Write a protein that binds this ligand. Structure first.
Ligand SMILES: Nc1ncnc2c1ncn2[C@@H]1O[C@H](COP(=O)(O)OP(=O)(O)O)[C@@H](O)[C@H]1O
Lengths: 269, 370, 57, 188
């Protein structure tokens, strides 16, 4: 049922972003034939798991999942345990753990806490992977929020010249609540998706992690600015459009003076 | 009153003053008060502790410079009031403030308390017939002779972009950033000190500004010119001493596009322009990209238009026509507009009279101000 | 008049919340820059992480 | 600058030290006899004891008011004529430039270093000057190690002892390959 799949996805866009897990489950039970397409297509909140081997909290993706079991990036083990041995190389384990260390310092500086997990899988042309970042607001603090971001990267390594093609896709989902006595209980949700393509120089001085790292933070900065300025601005404009504090009668006085000016400007030509 | 209204462009760098109808501002002087730091010993020495305009420029070495306005906001009012007294004095316009009306041209999204305090000066200290405060961007287009267009006015104090439709300014589409020309001059001084040329004194900082204005170009590719070894371009100081400016020429002005260089959490000048247009309704976005107007003194950098035009196209949507028009007299755009508005008969209804101010108070300016 | 005052304060508070979120809640979830007010130097972090762990211990 | 600035006061008192060898005695006098007054004007107005110092040759000099008037330059650069901020303004201004979240920690953690901090009553004078310039209701804790002069070296000894130091330094071979770039890459 292709028409039901379109209707299911179009509905989820309009439904509240906090009720996506419960609302998605209901649509899956109605049309269970398109369960795989709905789960894959629809953006879901990031689930967290505790690795008892290393003693570290890691974020769960679709890439690390081998059947039912999820691989922990710090331990490089599948929970529940498997004997499939799907690890593409030993060099990948060194690059993946080093990458996690790079973005572990990153999140501590920008976000200050939360969890970050980097999953790398090798490909014939060049390695790909996903970088999951999740930051939750303090429970005791009046301010409530939830940061979710998914950075999918595919690196196409060139034979000669050392100028790999970096393809980045970034999906951010933001929850906000302000419990100020003046306003009451304000809830402002949003979700944005963007893509970027560059051709950075790879070397010992300029490694893959350095080239990817700059592209990841650059996309987050553009999304942070655009959301706060463009989307949150437009939202404020509509609220002020609905009701006015100043009387229209007083506004029409200033409009009549402005209109008279415009006529006097077009007049004097 | 028959007397022509006086246009006063209270700019952070240079104040532009003159009568309505005038083609160019007659009286333009730097916006700071210079006080003598040295002691007077001989009889017949230079009289006064306050020097403004050409007297301060001639005997600059004796004086300690201090700008009253920072980011287009009057920090010291006592000095600002004395400068307006100088505007009316025999050296400048040479007219009574009680005879001529005033037209002020302030930056957008300024505090209300500033306009209220400014009004008190022109009604209480000066018994001015009428005062009207106007937006810089709206007047800038009136000077250019265009009703619809985006005005990117990067001044010495503040940089702002106002999208304006058929004369009207959309208050939600205005974007304002503190980073401006004076911050690049501070950044150049910091970089020259690392090169090994010290300019500690406030008088010596004016030489650093002169070096920037004379020899400073904005590179089309920053990382290319940053990596490549730069030619040591020599500059001759007032005393006669030669300093090698070298790479600092193009690395200094980059601050406008990269605010992290100074360490400010703000958007780049190229991001401000595109975002300001994107906030406007879908129907006008294509016209606002088509009609882009450059203004302010900080756009005068060599190859500014070439770098900005490249950045706008990258940030702007695909298959959009980006036409950026620069008037030859960028600096005078705000004042010329003010002169045009002041000459109109509709202006008589627009301003707030002294009597109206006394009755209503601060309310009278807020009601009639646009 | 009670309706007028209450709805004016409510709309005013929403306008204040937009400015407040930009400075507090929105920045609190993700800073524009680290507390140092500098962009992350990815080449320095790879070597510095090892140096700072032993130098700050 | 304090040693040269003291020399100016000694010449006005009538003690000449023109020679470069004689300036080293003025430097020894500066280090021996200079006090930072808690109230400048109070000690200027009061008549000093004119404490005598014994020179290498055997002659005695009366330092007098020049003792505490010379080192004031650190807090008032206007005295030498340089249009700079005072040392107490540098400390407070440098913290006020930093982000709001760290300012409180930076006021809590202030460390004094350098040779010119060894003046008697530097801590009590600086603390008073910081209070005037500092924001109201802020706690100020200034920590001065006993080995102020050797704090930079002792740091270098600790850093060099850490295993990470093997990765930190630039090898002779790396310098020969990349050149000036080598020290710029593994420093910055
Ligand atoms: N030729 C030039 N090249 C580069 N920058 C310039 C040039 N001339 C002036 N400037 C800069 O522009 C400033 C002038 O800004 P101005 O137009 O007076 O701003 P405002 O709108 O505040 O009046 C100068 O202080 C200087 O920093």
């Amino acid at each position: 049922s292709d028409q039901q799949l379109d209707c299911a996805l179009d509905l989820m866009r309009r439904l509240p972003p906090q009720q996506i897990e419960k609302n998605l489950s209901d649509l899956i039970d109605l049309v269970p034939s398109l369960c795989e397409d709905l789960l894959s297509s629809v953006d879901q909140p990031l689930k967290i798991a505790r690795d008892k081997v290393v003693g570290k909290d890691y974020l769960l993706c679709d890439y690390n999942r081998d059947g039912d079991s999820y691989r922990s990036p710090w331990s490089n083990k599948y929970d529940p345990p498997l004997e499939d041995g799907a690890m593409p190389s030993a060099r990948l384990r060194k690059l993946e753990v080093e990458a996690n260390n790079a973005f572990d310092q990153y999140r501590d500086l920008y976000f200050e806490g939360g969890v970050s997990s980097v999953y790398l899988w090798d490909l014939d042309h060049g390695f790909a992977g996903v970088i999951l970042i999740k930051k939750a607001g303090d429970g005791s603090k009046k301010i409530k929020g939830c940061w979710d971001s998914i950075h999918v990267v595919e690196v196409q390594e060139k034979s000669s010249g050392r100028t790999a093609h970096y393809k980045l896709t970034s999906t951010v989902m933001l929850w906000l609540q302000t419990n100020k006595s003046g306003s009451g209980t304000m809830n402002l949700g949003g979700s944005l998706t963007r893509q970027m393509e560059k051709d950075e120089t790879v070397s010992d001085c300029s490694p893959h992690i350095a080239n990817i790292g700059r592209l990841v933070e650059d996309m987050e900065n553009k999304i942070r600015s655009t959301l706060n300025e463009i989307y949150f601005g437009k939202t404020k404009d509509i609220v002020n459009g609905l009701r006015s504090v100043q009387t229209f009668a007083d506004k029409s006085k200033q409009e009549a003076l402005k209109n008279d000016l415009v006529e006097a400007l077009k007049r004097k030509q | 009153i028959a007397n022509q209204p006086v246009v006063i462009d209270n700019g952070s760098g240079v104040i532009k003053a003159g009568f309505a109808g005038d083609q160019i501002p007659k009286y333009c002087f730097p916006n700071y008060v210079g006080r003598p730091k040295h002691v007077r010993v001989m009889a017949g020495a230079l009289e006064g502790d306050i020097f403004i305009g050409p007297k301060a420029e001639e005997h600059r070495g004796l004086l300690s410079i201090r700008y009253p306005m920072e980011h287009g906001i009057v920090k010291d009012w006592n000095d600002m009031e004395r400068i307006w007294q100088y505007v009316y004095s025999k050296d400048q316009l040479q007219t009574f403030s009680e005879e001529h009306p005033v037209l002020l041209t302030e930056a957008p999204l300024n505090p209300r308390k500033n306009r209220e305090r400014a009004a008190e000066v022109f009604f209480e200290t000066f018994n001015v017939p009428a005062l009207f405060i106007s937006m810089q961007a709206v007047l800038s287009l009136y000077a250019t002779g265009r009703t619809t267009g985006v005005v990117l006015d990067s001044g010495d104090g503040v940089t702002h972009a106002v999208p304006i439709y058929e004369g009207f300014a959309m208050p939600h589409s205005i974007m304002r950033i503190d980073i401006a020309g004076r911050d690049v001059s501070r950044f150049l001084r910091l970089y020259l000190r690392k090169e090994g040329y010290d300019f500690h004194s406030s008088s010596e900082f004016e030489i650093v500004k002169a070096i920037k204005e004379r020899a400073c170009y904005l590179s089309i590719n920053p990382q290319k010119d940053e990596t490549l070894e730069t030619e040591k371009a020599q500059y001759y100081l007032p005393d006669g001493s030669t300093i090698e400016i070298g790479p600092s020429r193009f690395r200094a002005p980059e601050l406008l596009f990269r605010p992290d260089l100074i360490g400010e959490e703000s958007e780049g000048i190229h991001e401000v322009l595109v975002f300001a247009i994107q906030k406007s309704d879908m129907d006008l976005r294509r016209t606002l990209f088509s009609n882009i107007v450059l203004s302010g003194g900080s756009t005068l950098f060599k190859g500014f238009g070439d770098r900005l035009l490249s950045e706008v196209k990258k940030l702007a949507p695909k298959d959009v026509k980006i036409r950026i028009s620069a008037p030859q007299e960028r600096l005078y755009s705000t004042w010329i507009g003010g002169s045009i508005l002041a000459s109109l008969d509709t202006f008589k209804k627009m301003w707030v009279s002294k009597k109206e101010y006394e009755e209503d108070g601060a309310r009278s300016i807020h009601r009639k101000t646009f | 008049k009670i309706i007028e005052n209450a709805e004016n304060e409510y709309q005013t508070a929403i306008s204040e919340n937009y400015q407040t979120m930009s400075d507090t809640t929105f920045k609190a979830l993700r800073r524009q820059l680290p507390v140092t007010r500098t962009k992350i130097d990815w080449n320095k972090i790879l070597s510095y992480k090892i140096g700072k762990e032993m130098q700050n211990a």
